[PDB]
Amino acid sequence: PNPAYPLSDQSNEGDWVLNTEMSDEFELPLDEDKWLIQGRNNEYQSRFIGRAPSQFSVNNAYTESGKLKIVTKWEPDYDFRLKFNGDDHDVVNGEKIYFENITTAAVISKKQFRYGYMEIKCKSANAPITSSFWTTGKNTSEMDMFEMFGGHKTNDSWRKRLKFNIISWDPNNPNYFNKINGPVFTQNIQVGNNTAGDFHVYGFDWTADYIKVYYDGVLLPEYTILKSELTNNNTNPDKWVTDSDYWIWFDSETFPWLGIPKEEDLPAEYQIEYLRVWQKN
Numbered sequence: 001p002n003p004a005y006p007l008s009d010q011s012n013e014g015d016w017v018l019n020t021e022m023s024d025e026f027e028l029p030l031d032e033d034k035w036l037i038q039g040r041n042n043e044y045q046s047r048f049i050g051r052a053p054s055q056f057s058v059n060n061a062y063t064e065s066g067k068l069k070i071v072t073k074w075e076p077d078y079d080f081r082l083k084f085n086g087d088d089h090d091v092v093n094g095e096k097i098y099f100e101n102i103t104t105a106a107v108i109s110k111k112q113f114r115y116g117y118m119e120i121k122c123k124s125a126n127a128p129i130t131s132s133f134w135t136t137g138k139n140t141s142e143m144d145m146f147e148m149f150g151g152h153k154t155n156d157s158w159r160k161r162l163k164f165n166i167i168s169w170d171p172n173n174p175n176y177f178n179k180i181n182g183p184v185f186t187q188n189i190q191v192g193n194n195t196a197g198d199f200h201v202y203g204f205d206w207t208a209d210y211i212k213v214y215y216d217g218v219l220l221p222e223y224t225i226l227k228s229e230l231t232n233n234n235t236n237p238d239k240w241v242t243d244s245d246y247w248i249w250f251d252s253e254t255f256p257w258l259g260i261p262k263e264e265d266l267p268a269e270y271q272i273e274y275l276r277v278w279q280k281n
Contacts, residue, residue, distance in 0.1 A: 006117045006278060007201050007217035014117065016278035021111040022248060025274045026068045030061065030107075037061045038106035038251070044084070045108045045247065046136060052090035052097040054129070054254040055080050060105035068107060070252045070270040072129045074263040075103045097256055102266070104129065106251035112137070114245045116279040118204045119214075120272060124150030125252055126196040127268035128259030133202070135246035142167040143211075143242055145204045146189065149258055150196025151265060158258070159196065162189035164213070164223070168241045175238055184241055185230060189223050191215045199273055208243055248275070 005012045024034065036045060038056040050056040057078060060071040080099040082088055089096040124131035128151050134144040146162035149155075165183040168175040175184040192215070193200060203214030211225040230239045252270050254260055261268070 001217070003276070006119050006203055006205075006214070006276070008203050008214040008219060009117070010217075014278070015281040016117060017281045019113055019116060019277045019279050022109055022113050022116070022277035023275055024068070025066070026063045026272060027066050028063065030063045030068065034110060036108040036110055038108060045106070045249070047084040048106070049081060049083055050099070050104060050106075051253040051255070052092070053100045053256065053260065054102040054104045054252075055099050056106045056251070057103040058105070060103050061107045066273060068250065068272040070105045070107065070125070070131070070250055070272070071103075072125055072127055072252050072261065072266055072268045072270075073103045074101060074261070074266040076101045078103050092256055101263075102129075102254055102261065104252040104254070106249060109248040112245040112247050113277060113279065114243070115207050116277050118145065118206065118248070119201060119274075119276040119278075120145075121199055121201045121274050122270065122272045123197075123199045124148040124195040125268035125270040127151040127261045127265040128153055129261055129268060129270075130251070130253045130255055131195070131270035132249070132251055132253065134249045134251075136169070136249065137244035137246050139170055140244035141169055141184075141241035143206070143246065146202065147255075148195040149255065150194065150270075151261070151268065153259060157188070157190065159194045160191055162191065162195070162202065162213075164189050166225075166242060168238075170241065173238050173241060175241065184239055185225065187223055187225075189213055189220065191220075199271070206242065211242065248277070250275075
């Protein structure tokens with residue numbers, strides 16, 4: 001296939017132009033003028049040090065073999081830090097979940113963009129750890145294009161799952177996460193192959209009016225999101241929160257309610273062969 005165009009649009013019906021600021025083939029050492037390794041020089045996007053028990057380490061993101069590696073390690077002697085609020089723990093189901101044992105990483109674009117075709121070729125980490133591809137905007141919203149859980153020990157659907165979420169981070173919005181304690185919208189994108197078994201190409205076409213999902217070049221129409229549906233024909237406009245500039249994130253996190261890796265599961269690698277972000281000419 002031609003890498004100049006989305007795998008799902010090889011005739012370039014979209015008149016696509018690669019956004020070089022947001023794109024990377026990861027064939028060189030990680031470009032830290034393009035990418036924030038979370039925690040580099042104590043810089044934390046969204047003040048997010050990691051999801052307990054895991055914490056983001058600057059040593060767990062690097063390129064290797066043409067891929068960005070987001071590594072999950074068993075590292076009990078890591079110098080786990082406190083949250084920006086001074087806590088040594090997250091609060092999950094009302095319980096204090098302490099930081100310990102596991103390091104992951106997060107890599108965030110230093111630039112933002114609004115609307116485009118995002119195509120990521122990746123293989124999820126083969127452990128009970130997330131491999132995620134997502135966005136944030138300042139006080140606006142967050143689109144989790146996927147949370148994978150490639151090494152789920154007991155759920156085969158999760159091994160083939162891309163959990164997709166849209167979250168409102170705007171306190172003015174009735175769907176604000178800290179009002180409804182959940183996403184504006186979520187769906188389980190199910191693909192045909194285990195996300196940790198091989199590299200696959202995942203496409204997310206993000207526009208002002210729809211979000212579409214592509215797998216290995218093929219539209220998955222069951223997962224299309226339409227503004228007219230989410231807003232019920234513009235009668236509930238606050239349900240459409242993705243008209244925002246976004247940073248792009250890759251990361252891995254412990255989701256303790258799904259599972260926690262054993263040392264025997266680690267190290268594990270979320271491997272990103274490339275990110276291609278196109279926008280319309």
